[PDB]
RNA sequence: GAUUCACGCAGUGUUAACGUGCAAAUUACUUGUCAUAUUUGAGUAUAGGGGCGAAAGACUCAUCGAACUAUCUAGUAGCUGG
RNA sequence: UGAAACUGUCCUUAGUGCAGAUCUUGGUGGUAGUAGCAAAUACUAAGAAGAGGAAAAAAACAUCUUAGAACUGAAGAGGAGAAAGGUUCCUAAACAACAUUACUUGGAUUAGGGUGAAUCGAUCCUAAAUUACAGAUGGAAAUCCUUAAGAAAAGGAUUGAAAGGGAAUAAGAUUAAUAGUUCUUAAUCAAGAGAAUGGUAACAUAUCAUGAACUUUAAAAUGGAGUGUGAAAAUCUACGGAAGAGUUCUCUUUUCUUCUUAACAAAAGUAAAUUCCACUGAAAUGAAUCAAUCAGAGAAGUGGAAUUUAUUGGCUUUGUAAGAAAUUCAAUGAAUUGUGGUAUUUUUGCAGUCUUCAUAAAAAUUAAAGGGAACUUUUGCUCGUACUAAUAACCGCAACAGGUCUCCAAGAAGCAAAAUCUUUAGUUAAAUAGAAUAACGCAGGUAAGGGAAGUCGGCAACAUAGCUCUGUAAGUUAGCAAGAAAGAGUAGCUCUGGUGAUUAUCGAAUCAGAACUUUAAAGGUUAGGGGAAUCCGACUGUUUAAUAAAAACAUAGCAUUCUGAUAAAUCUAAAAGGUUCAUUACAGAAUGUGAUUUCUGCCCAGUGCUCUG
RNA sequence: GGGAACGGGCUUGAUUGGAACGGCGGGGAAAGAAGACCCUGUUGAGCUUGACUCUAAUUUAUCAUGUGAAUUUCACUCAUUUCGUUAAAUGUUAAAAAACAUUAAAUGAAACAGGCGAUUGAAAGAGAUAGACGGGGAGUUUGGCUGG
RNA sequence: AAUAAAAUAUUACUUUGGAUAGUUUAGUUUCCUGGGCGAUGAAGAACGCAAUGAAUUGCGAUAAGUGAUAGGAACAAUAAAAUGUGAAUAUCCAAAAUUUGAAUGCUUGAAAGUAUACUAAGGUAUAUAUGAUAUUCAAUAUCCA
């Protein structure tokens, strides 16, 4: 919203920081099965409800 | 079963009084020496209209006799009171209109409104619009006086009770026929929530004990004992006589 | 109009995030949290919700100063 | 014919959110927040407005010059000249009446 | 334009720029970015040139 | 708390359209209504043998002649299927 | 085929043998290349980029520029906000997936960038309300009281509004996006720092001109309806122009665009309304408004005073300020920016009138009075600020024809913010198109002669419709019925007259009348069918969200019962506990019938209620 | 035709070319739902009532020991009820006038009480036992045979 | 009377799908030892920190880690740096330990804040009930001059 409290803006800021994919170098490790982020979301698919 | 509308009216959820624009508590002033053994002088600053009652409230402004400053009050307006008036409220006050007197000084047959029920509670009896209580007699043996309440019942009160002389203003209010539904709906602007009243016999059996069957009727006598349980106490409670009076 | 038509005026939030449990369970009008029993001092635990105990109880977090004492 | 928009976040035409549209350089039309209308002072006995004191906001009286918020007279600023002419005669005729009564 | 810590304000930032770079500051504008970092728009005095301060920091 | 037009709102009739739809109740024309018992926003109050109801057993998060969720609970069944 | 475990006999043990439980879970068919991809008027030509219009018409082709043609039509398909969403915002690269074809496009993939406040809000105050210590109640959980019970808080505690109250900011410019937030210029507020005169009177003096305790007054602070009017803006228009653009073989001194100015302050000139003051004292009564209303507790007249009128002082004018901006010319430099209106609408104030058995908030905070105790400079902290605000950013499982609170508002035409068309602005894409023009369909129509014979029933459809004049029954609560019913007129062009201001000029749409002509005229759009009877409900009103909208519910009226307030009703397990009650019989509580008029008959045995027996 | 008495399949016949496009409603006792009408449950639920058995509310009697006295009737306050204030002169001695009134001049402004000021009062209310009332409320039941 | 386009039947190879066979850093039950949190601030929640991290693990402004004691030559996806003058690793140790939370100075909604005293920013103490001690008071409640 236009008017968000301080403790509410910093929680939104973490939810856009966590909405990022796997770094390229991480997937190239040995025995690394973490190829995709399954905790991801989007603004039009799933409302995070917060 | 259910809880009828008389059972939900006791909790006070939406049935609380709409007393938000009300001026305040209309009553005499606190008892003291200057009123018990002398007289004070009050100025009727202005007549006001306390919402939710048909008797105007007058804003009397006394002087603090023990300290420095004004002692503003709020008196129910007896009929005939005007702005700029001087009303004296004491035991030795003169028997005029609006002058508060102890009930034990008024001659028999004097008209007193807003009479106390016990010396010091500041007004109980005869407060509505256009109503008054008339003194009957006196009894110096036990300092008690008889008066006739506006209901016709006669009550015995101590002679120290204060009672403003006269009848209450705004009389003859109900003689006007409310013509519409809207006028009756606006009358409850500053009262509780009870106007549109749905009949018991136009109700299903759960809501009211009068909920009828295939014909709209009661089915059992409406005259009930006083000792009925709350919820079934409907109709006429402890009726000595019913029907039109001939 | 008890279905799709009446679902258009839902924009006045009722439950906001709580402070002691972190779930969206703080009832604004009742002023108490429905999941962790806020201002009430005791954490709200009921025996019929045996699953609601193992979702948040001792051991489910970091155990910052308790994993030390038990080791000693 | 230029259509303007509220410049503050207030979007409702409340009493505190009155605006006036004025012209501006180049034919642009802008929005200004105009203040509310207030009542003047009133005599303490008759309830009539007093002359010589402007009808402005309660705090704006502080910025006025010390002679721009009173009237130079006994009970000047709290009672009308009729409200005071009667005070003097009451305070004098009464004193003469009870001077000889007792 | 810097990236200060959130818990500062327009007073302990005005001194921190003046003390760390030996300059004069006449205006600080701050905002809290989403990440939590506070971006401060420190405006130096007219006599001091920000270009020579910027090269000293290493921006250019 | 007069008669009507309009912005809006409703839902009288076609028992029209659609009826694996735009829609888990909507669309078109026709009709009524369109400021005082008027329409509406936000905050606050009232919670399950309870609330609220200009009264239809109606409304109480697509659930009401007794809401949703969990524990007793793998309830009991002389009855149907395997 | 496969690549590291396994088999036979005896005994023991079992979570041991499947075709069914509408069985549970997982996968896959026929239906089937079928039904579909049809509301929202609409696209075409040239060019660019691109693998992505080739071709025996493979008749269709996504994004961007221009031209043509159009729609929403200013209560918008325009410009912005609150709630909700949370990165959707902007740019670059890129197209495996997703937007019922495709996409070079995207609210989609990846990576960067973006949200600037002493003046806007939060913060501060209180509203309906909410919650603490002590106290009371309670087996218990916990409940009640919120200033009453208190050695607590001068008089009473906490929370409660981004729509209520509130100290102070504007114009121009800038960015790929932020700007009452940045830059230039120009201001404002708060907190500091460095015992006076004038006027008869109303009252007045670029801070001035002392003013403590205590007290009071006032502002903050308040319903609605209708009329009249001042002012500004928009639209329209008159006189005189400056610059540019459009039409021109047929004419038009023609049609269009621009000609502007803030916050804050000053006083050349000059208004409307209201309330007061001084002189005199009204009758032959006057003064005045659209309406009213006012006067010997004092009218009219003359002279004054104060206040309101979007910041100072309302309008013009001035500083700000032309140096800005708009429109042009030349290739950074040059030109201009008068004066009116007895026109319509909107906005904001003022004046009285009307209506209530409705009288239509509180505090923070500020000023004055009664009383007499003793020009400069510094700082202004924290939090929000991007974006949509919807036929694609919210809620509906989604780019759902549903739902969702607001501000700004051009022309034609009309009584109308109606229907229909256009200007500034937005868009041509919004679940795919081409061909053929069968049936049966959905939506929209028309018709010979008859006109409800169709059918449960005039269902559906057709027909009357605006305005002016004439006329208008029975019944009736005397108000209504009534737009009753019924009849006449209406176009175009050229004329005439009536309705005003100033001393002949000037301005307004409005009414009436007369010639002449025609295709004989409200009808493109908007736009009552009428009558005679019967039943119910008195009327306006409300209801089964999603099959019942009424003859039901309500309602004003009539009537009945209890109650003197420590009461009646009545919530709680309990309570110095709670509701009507900030109350007091013209009141509180419990009921039946349902306007007005007329009338409510006989019955107290039975069952209830009551009794002074 | 018989059949579970209205077959696509069985028996006897009529008759039969492979694939399937547009239509249209006769058949598939077509699809949608463990019939909602009826009956059987020793299965429920709402509602009603002198159905059975209880219960909150209301009411009546007894117990719970204030003093002075002459089971009952009086007087007092001391528990107790209902109140009111800024706990602000209790008890006893010596209506002409919508105005102001305060921080005292020189003890002024009297003392004492075992009661802040009143009302009710040994009655009332709360508890225990007992009788009455009580669909306001809880729990439950409402046989069988039977040409349905 | 005829064709095998459709249809049907068997086998082989391929596809959609993951049954069967082999394995298991995971579980279930039983028994043994303990049953060791908290105003010195617990359990839980939130935010933040890697050279390149989104999760997760580890940790708390000394941050995927510091000091000490044991330990003996690594880490690795890639580039860097450090390293027998001691890299990895381990621990009932020392230092440190953000905002909250019984939450405790007042307030706390998604709230931004804020008062007094001690030592401009920084750190401390100040909630309720409670025992003991010390100090300051109130009541004529009992005596008494």
UniProtKB/Swiss-Prot annotation, chain B:
A GO BP annotation: cytoplasmic translation
Segments for region (Disordered): 206-246
SMART domains for the chain: Ribosomal_L2, Ribosomal_L2_C
Pfam families documented for this protein: Ribosomal_L2 (PF00181), Ribosomal_L2_C (PF03947)
Keyword Iron included in the entry's annotation: no
GO cellular component terms, semicolon-separated: cytosolic large ribosomal subunit
PROSITE patterns in alphabetical order: RIBOSOMAL_L2
Keyword Ribosomal protein appears in the UniProt entry: yes
Organism domain of life: Eukaryota
Xref: PANTHER family: LARGE RIBOSOMAL SUBUNIT PROTEIN UL2, RIBOSOMAL PROTEIN L2
UniProt-recorded name of the protein: Large ribosomal subunit protein uL2
Species annotation: Entamoeba histolytica (strain ATCC 30459 / HM-1:IMSS / ABRM)
């Amino acid at each position: 919203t236009g008017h968000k409290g301080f403790s509410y803006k910093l929680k939104l800021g973490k939810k856009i920081h966590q909405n990022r994919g796997v770094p390229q170098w991480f997937r190239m490790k040995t025995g690394n099965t973490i190829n995709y982020n399954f905790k991801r979301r989007h603004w039009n698919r799933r409302k995070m409800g917060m | 079963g259910r809880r009828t509308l008389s059972q939900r009216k006791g909790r006070g959820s939406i049935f609380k009084s709409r007393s938000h624009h009300k001026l305040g508590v209309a009553q005499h002033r606190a008892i003291d020496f200057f009123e018990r053994h002398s007289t004070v002088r009050g100025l009727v600053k202005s007549i006001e209209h306390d919402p939710g009652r048909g008797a105007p409230l007058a804003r009397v402004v006394f002087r603090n006799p023990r300290q420095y400053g004004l002692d503003k009050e709020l008196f129910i307006c007896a009929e005939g009171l005007y702005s700029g008036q001087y009303i004296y409220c004491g035991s030795k006050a003169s028997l005029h209109i609006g002058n508060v007197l102890p009930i034990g000084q008024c001659p028999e047959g004097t008209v007193v409104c807003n009479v106390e029920s016990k010396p010091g509670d500041r007004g109980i009896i005869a407060r509505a619009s256009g109503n008054y209580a008339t003194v009957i007699s006196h009894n110096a043996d036990n300092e008690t006086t008889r008066i006739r309440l506006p209901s016709g019942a006669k009550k015995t009160l101590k002679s120290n009770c204060r009672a403003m002389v006269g009848i209450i203003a705004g009389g003859g209010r109900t003689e006007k026929p409310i013509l519409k539904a809207g006028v009756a709906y606006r009358m409850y602007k500053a009262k509780r929530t009870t106007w549109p009243r749905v009949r018991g016999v136009a109700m299903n059996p759960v809501d009211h004990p009068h909920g009828g069957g295939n014909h709209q009727h009661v089915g059992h006598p409406t005259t009930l004992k006083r000792s009925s349980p709350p919820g079934q106490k409907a109709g006429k409670v402890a009726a000595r006589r019913t029907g039109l009076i001939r | 109009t008890k279905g799709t038509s009446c679902r258009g005026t839902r924009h006045n939030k009722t439950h906001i995030l709580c402070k002691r449990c972190g779930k969206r369970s703080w009832h604004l009008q009742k002023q108490r949290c429905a999941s962790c029993g806020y201002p009430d001092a005791k954490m709200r635990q009921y025996a019929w919700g045996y699953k609601a105990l193992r979702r948040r109880t001792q051991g489910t977090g970091r155990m910052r100063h308790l994993k030390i004492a038990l080791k000693r | 014919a230029v259509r303007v928009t509220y410049v503050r976040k207030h979007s409702y035409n409340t009493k505190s959110n009155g605006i006036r549209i004025v012209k501006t350089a180049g034919g642009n039309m802008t929005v200004q927040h105009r203040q509310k209308i207030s009542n003047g002072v009133r005599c303490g006995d008759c309830g009539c407005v007093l002359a010589g004191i402007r009808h402005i906001r309660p705090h704006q009286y502080g910025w006025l010059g010390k002679s721009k918020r009173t009237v130079t007279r006994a009970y000047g600023g709290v009672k009308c000249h009729k409200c005071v002419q009667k005070k003097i005669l009451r305070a004098f005729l009464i004193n003469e009446h009870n001077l000889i009564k007792l | 334009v810097f990236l200060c810590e959130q818990k500062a304000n327009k007073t302990m930032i005005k001194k921190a720029v003046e003390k760390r770079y030996g300059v004069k500051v006449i205006k600080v504008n701050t905002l809290v970015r989403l990440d939590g970092l506070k971006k401060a728009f420190v405006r130096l005095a007219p006599d001091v040139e920000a270009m020579e301060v910027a090269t000293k920091i290493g921006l250019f």
